[PDB]
């Protein structure tokens, strides 16, 4: 069973934007993944401080760089704390909360702020280089779930029934038939140099 659902109005217009622009630096896709990455590791492993049983979905703590081919995709794969339901589709699609106004609500009902900017909008910017994206998800007791668009101002989610994760995120990007230097291993690599050296987790290309 498939759920589908209207990307709010504002984030829309973005979208839209971004399919139709011939903005130059569409290279800069890939460090706001691998940082929603590396902050969804943060999570895991501060989270993992106090509950140590966190990690019994798998202890490396990481990123991968999967790029195809013959498939015309580039995937990124990371080990962190995951996404539920609800922040798939809170935080990649239908909502756009102030940063501001989710504050003060925070502090009203006497919660953490950690969430008060949820997952940004720069991701957003994987539509400068893929016509589709997909995202894999699987968080601690909650089910694995598959997010798709192909950015026509809906997206859907459903259940995944593919091959169990484990615990993380996997994003798939099928690449526009212009933009395939992105499956390339030297222009990879060169744009993880100029813009995600210092991450603090391994970045692991593999080799076709
Ligand atoms: C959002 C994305 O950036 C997915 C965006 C795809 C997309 C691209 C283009 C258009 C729509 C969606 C993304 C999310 C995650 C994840 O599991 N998080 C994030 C985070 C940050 C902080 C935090 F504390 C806990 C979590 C959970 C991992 C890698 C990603 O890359």
Known sequence: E?????????????????????????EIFLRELISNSSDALDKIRYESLTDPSKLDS??????????????????????????????????????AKSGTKAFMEALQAGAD??????????????????????????????????????????????????????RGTKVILHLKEDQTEYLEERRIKEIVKKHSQFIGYPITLFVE
């Not at 013959?70 to 589709?89: F, P, S, W």
């Open 2 to 26: 498939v759920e589908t659902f209207a990307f709010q109005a504002e984030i829309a217009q973005l979208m839209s934007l971004i399919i139709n622009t011939f903005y130059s630096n569409k």
């Open 58 to 95: 798998g202890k490396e703590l990481h990123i991968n760089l999967i790029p195809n081919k013959q498939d015309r995709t580039l995937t990124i794969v990371d080990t962190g704390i995951g996404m539920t339901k609800a922040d798939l589709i809170n935080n990649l699609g239908t909502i």
């Open 113 to 166: 702020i950690s969430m008060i900017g949820q997952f940004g909008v720069g991701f957003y910017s994987a539509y400068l280089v893929a016509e589709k994206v997909t995202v894999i998800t699987k968080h601690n007791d909650d089910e694995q779930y598959a997010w798709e668009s192909s950015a026509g101002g809906s997206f859907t989610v459903r259940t995944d029934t593919g091959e169990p994760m484990g």
